[PDB]
Structure formats: C-alpha cells, structure tokens
Amino acid sequence: FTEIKSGFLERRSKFLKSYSKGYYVLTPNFLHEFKTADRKKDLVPVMSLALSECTVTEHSRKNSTSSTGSDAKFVLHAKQNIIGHNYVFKADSYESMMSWFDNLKILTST
Amino acid sequence: PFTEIKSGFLERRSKFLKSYSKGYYVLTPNFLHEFKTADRKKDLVPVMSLALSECTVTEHSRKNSGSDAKFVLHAKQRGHNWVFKADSYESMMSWFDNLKILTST
Amino acid sequence: FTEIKSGFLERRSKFLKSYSKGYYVLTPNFLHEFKTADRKKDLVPVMSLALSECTVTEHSRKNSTSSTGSDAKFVLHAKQNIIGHNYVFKADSYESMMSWFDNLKILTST
Amino acid sequence: PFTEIKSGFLERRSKFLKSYSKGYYVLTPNFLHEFKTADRKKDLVPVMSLALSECTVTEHSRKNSGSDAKFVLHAKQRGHNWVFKADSYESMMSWFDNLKILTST
Helix, strand or coil, rough: CCCEEEEEEEEEEEECCCCEEEEEECCEEEEEECCCCCCCCCCCCCCCEHHEEEEEEEEEECCCCCCCCCCCEEEEEEEECCCCCEEEECCCCHHHHHHHHHHHHHHHCC | CCCEEEEEHHHHCCCCEEEEEEEEECCCEEEEEEECCCCCCCCCCCCEEEEHHEEEEEEECCCCCCCCCCCEEECCCCCEEEEEEEHHHHHHHHHHHHHHHCCCC | CCCCCCEEEEEEEEEEEEEEEEEECCCCCCEEEEEECCCCCCCCCEEEEEEEHHHHHHCCCCCCCCCCCCCCCCEEEECCCCCCCCCCEEECHHHHHHHHHHHHHHCCCC | CCCEEEEEEEEEEEEECEEEEEEEEECCCCEEEEECCCCCCCCCCCCEEEEEEEEEEEEECHHHHHHHCCCEEEEECCCCCCEEEECCHHHHHHHHHHHCCCCCC
C-alpha cells in the first residue's frame, strides 16, 4: 500500500518472558507495529523500526522443538542506538515465519 | 525511508502554542514523516508519521504579486488542519503537488 | 501496489465508433493499460498515459441517456503531443465511472 | 512519474548488438522506466517499463582496488538478465540498493 508484507506477529519481552501481539506492516523502509489490522481507522504506528539499522539473524527450523510456535520464530537484531539488543518474534507457522524472514533478510542485507 | 519521494525542511504551526517549528520531512508512498534532523544515517525514528491514506491537502498560499509559502494538510480521524510553511512559494507548491497525487483517494 | 485504482474500462475508437476493453491501472503517475487482470504474468503495459499532460473534462450524469453505459462515460483530454485529442472511456456503472473520474480529476488538476 | 524514488542516466547492454546505450531511468515503486531524455515535461512516454514485481537484482561489480560500475537485473517471465552500467561504483550501488528494497518479494 505500498507494503511488502502485513500480518500478526507476537513479540517477546526479554525480561518478562512473555509475548505481546500486534499487527505488523513491513515496507521497504520500516517494520511498523499497529494495535489492530484496521488500515482505515488505525493509522498511527505504535512503533516504527528502521530497516536500515536492523539485521535478521537466526530463525527456527521446521523441526525446531520446545510450547507454542517453536518452529515459527526469528530474531531481529539492532545495529544502531532502540539500543544491539535482539527482538524475538513469533509467527503463526514456519511458512509464515519464513515469509517474514526471507523478506527481512533482503531488506537488511549488505 | 529510501523509497523517499521528496524530502526537505518544513515549518509546522502549533495552534495552541502559537509558534512554528522546523523539522526535516520525508515523503514516502505511505507517510509524511517528520524527523528532527536531516541525518538519515543516525536519526532514524520519526517524531511523527502522518498516514497519507487519511490526509488531503486543501488550500495553499497565493503567490505574492507575509509568507506566501504555506499549505494546509487536513485529516480525517478528524477535522484536524495542520499548517505548513516552506522556504518559498515554489518549494511550497512542490510539496503541495507531491502530496496531492499521493492523497487523491 | 502502489495503485490508486484498477479495473476494466472500455475505450472508444473515434473513427470506428466501437469500444475495446482493457484492464487499467491508475497510479499517481500514469494510466496504464494491460490486456488482462493477471498482475503476476501480465506485466508490460500496452500503453502508459502520463497524467501530467492529461485532464478529465466531462463525465456522464446518473441520468444521462442514449445503448450501453450511457451513465458511465468520461472524457480524458490530452494537453501535450499521444497528439489535444480526447479519449472516451466507459466504465461498468455510474458509481464506477465516478470513482475513476474523481481520482483522475485530482491527479490532473491545477 | 513524480512519485520518483530515484532517477539518473544509466547505460544498458544489448546482448545481440554487443553495445551499450545510455538512457534516462526513473525508478518508481512499481517500475524501472527508461526514457530517451531527462526532460520530464516533454518526454513523457517510457521507451520501456520494467515491472519490479518480477525483477530481482542479483550481482554487481566489485569495487576496483575496466568498469566496476555494473549490475545485473534479472527477470522471471523468464531467465533474462539485463546488464546495466552506471557512472561509478558509488552510483551503481545506489541503484542496486534502491532496486533491491523494491524487489524483495
């Protein structure tokens, strides 16, 4: 819109060992977080992460094991000071995770 | 924001504070972003991101013939009207026209 | 994609007094014509009309009368030399026509 | 094409004719367009419009340390590989990177 990908992801809290869910939109420039999927009424990102200073490092394998989504996670790494502290995201499936990861890898590659 | 369509300094008016503040604006197909500085390598988090899908540009200054370099950006969710001021009528018209074609829907 | 509008339009031949149908995509910059609606395999416009040198002039009223689509036409005018010779387009309905026209009017306005 | 992301002169190689030809390229979110000239007011019909949705940028020159300012644009519908040459490695890398982020899907 122009968007590369959009959908729900859960993001892990380092300290709280829990996840929070948001609706994410990946553009050529940013990973934006929104509270909802209503693109007509929910238009202010709660957060926008600039891809220029991120990298995606690891991701689950289809066979990765242990509770939910053990095969559906990826790590987004910061290269500049949101502090490089890593964000762990969890998608709904391996296939969905790989779609996010494959796009992020090219957008953040060198 | 390297799918940038246009960028440059603009002043934006605050209604309540009765003052202008200059920011560095970047227009993409999705947003008009405000950043504090023009350093696209170190200043990466927008101060503000205005979704183009619910903005329209309505009026602008008539050229002199006081600043004639202003335009209004209107919001729907709702009745909001930001006033911007560019360096010249010419620069204002570039912003206005570029915003217009990204906000026709 | 980024697109403002897309859909089927019929375009009139001045000399032949007949219409030909295409799939059109309106962007902030162009009115593109494609042979089909398959955005995955049909990717070369047969024609791209630059909006910078077009204007939309008249359009049908909901009550415009006489054979098909008498309430669904609009005229796209050229301001520079595709020669200003006018193109007449016909949409599927008044409502659809107005969507095309309203967008074109702002994109080509002064 | 005023939602232009990038524009500039590039040389494109013809495989059959064994020659380069310089054109003025305009990158939008949808296409890489070739125009004969840089006159955006009088030269309005693209010579060629390459749909980004089915292109990828694959390889590029390594910096010198012969031109080191080339990159390959690959097509799917299918196996097509256009070679482009920019004025410098630096200019080539700007094209390459801007194309890359519009062609990740």
